[PDB]
C-alpha cells in the first residue's frame, strides 16, 4: 500500500472518509492562537496511484480532491496539507509548512535532503493549483525568522523562493551573504557545496535569476555568491583561441547581462571595498577575478589590478586574463581615445603601464600552462586600437606602451606576423600623425617639437 498523511486546521472526534478506494484520527499539537492542527494517516492501495480520491471531514466548504501523483512520490508516502475545516489560515499553514519541511534539515545528508525536496515538491504542487502578496510577505517573514552550514541553507532558501516565486523584496543582502562562503580554501567550499548541488535540480537557473536581480536592482553583494554559481555552471576549459570566447563565457557569467550593470553602476568604490573584504574568494574560485574584471567599468580597472596585486602574485595566470578583459573593453577604450579628454586617456595610459608592471614584475612567474599565444594576438588587437584611435602626436606614449607589451609577450615566448602587424600599425600612426615635413622652410626649427 501507498500511504497518505492528511493534515487539517480548525471534545470532538474528527474522521477521514470519502470514496471507497481505501463506506461512511489523532490530536497532533494544539497550536493555540485559536486553532489546532489535526492530522491523520491512511494507507490506500498501490493501484490507486495518481487517481482522484475526493475526501471529506466529519466539512464546510466555501468536495475536496486528492492526487497522489507518481511524479512526486518518493519513498512511497504522500503528504496532503493546507486542508482547512481563509487568508489567515493560508498564512498560518504556510508558517507550519515551512517549519515542518525545515525540521528535516537537522541532519544534513542526501537522505533528509531528498526527503525535504520531495515533501516540498508534493505540497507545492498541491498548493499552486488548489482544486497573494500577503502570503509571500508572511512567508518571507517566517523564513528570515527561522533562518536568522550556511551555504547549504542559502541554496535551500534559494530553491524554495524560486519554487514559491518569492522575489527577494529589498533584502537580497541576507541571502547573498548566506551564499557567500567564508571558506578561505577551495576544497572546503566544494565540500560544503557538493552534498547539496549533487542533487538533480535547477541550481544554475535559480542562481542566475538571483544574480540578474541584485544587478537590475543595483546592488553588489551578489558578487560574493558568484563562486557558487560557477560550481553550478560547469564551465568548459579554455581553447587555443580563448580570446574568441564571448565576454559572458570567458568571465563565467553566462546567462547574465552585466554590461548594462557595469556601465550603469554609479558607485564603484563600494564595489571595490566589498571585493577587498572578500578577496579570499579569488583563491577558491579562479574565474571570479575575471568575472569581477568584467563587472568593473574602464574607469576603475587600475584599482582592481592594484588592490589585488598580491593575488596575481599568488596566481600569475590571472595576469593574462587582464589583457583579455581589456580586449573585451576595446570599444569603450576607443570611445575614450577618439575623444581628447586628458583624464580618460591618462587612465588608459595608467592601465597599460599597470599591465607592463605586471608583465615585467611577474615575467619570471607566469605558468607555461596558461601562457597561450592567443594573448599575443590579443595584445596586437590592443595595439591597433591604440594606434587607430590615438590621432594626436602628444599621445605617443600609448602606442609605445602597446608595443612594449607586445615586446614583453614575445620575450615570454605567429610571432613574426604579430610583429609585422605591430610595426605596420606604428608606421600607420606615424604617417597619419606626421603629415607635414620635419623641418621648416629654413631648416632652423623642427615642425613637430616632439618628433
Residue numbers in the entry: 378 to 387, 397 to 408, 412 to 413, 420 to 453, 463 to 466, 477 to 499, 522 to 567, 583 to 599, ...
What does the study report here?
Similar to murine RNF213, we find that the human orthologue appeared as a monomer with an ATP bound to its catalytically inactive AAA2 ATPase domain. Accounting for the flexibility between the individual domains of RNF213, the murine and human structures can be flexibly superimposed with mean Cα deviation of less than 2.1 Å, indicating an overall conserved protein fold. By solving the cryo-EM structure of human RNF213, we discovered a carbohydrate-binding CBM20 domain in its previously unresolved N-terminus. Due to the flexibility of the CBM20 domain relative to the stalk, the CBM20 domain in human RNF213 is resolved at a local resolution of ~4.5 Å. We therefore created an AlphaFold model of the region of interest, which, in agreement with the cryo-EM density, predicts the existence of a beta-sandwich structure in the domain and thus supports our experimental evidence for the existence of a bona fide CBM20 domain in RNF213. A large cluster of 23 positively selected residues covers the CBM20 domain and the exterior face of the adjacent stalk region. The RZ finger is connected to the E3 module via linker peptides that provide the domain with significant flexibility, thus explaining its apparent absence from the previously published murine RNF213 model and its relatively poor resolution in the human RNF213 structure. Aided by the model, the cryo-EM structure of RNF213 reveals that the RZ domain is comprised of a short alpha helix and two beta-sheets, each comprising two anti-parallel beta-strands. The resulting beta sandwich structure is stabilized through a bound metal ion, presumably Zn2+, which is coordinated by four evolutionarily conserved Cys and His residues (C4505, H4509, C4525, C4528).
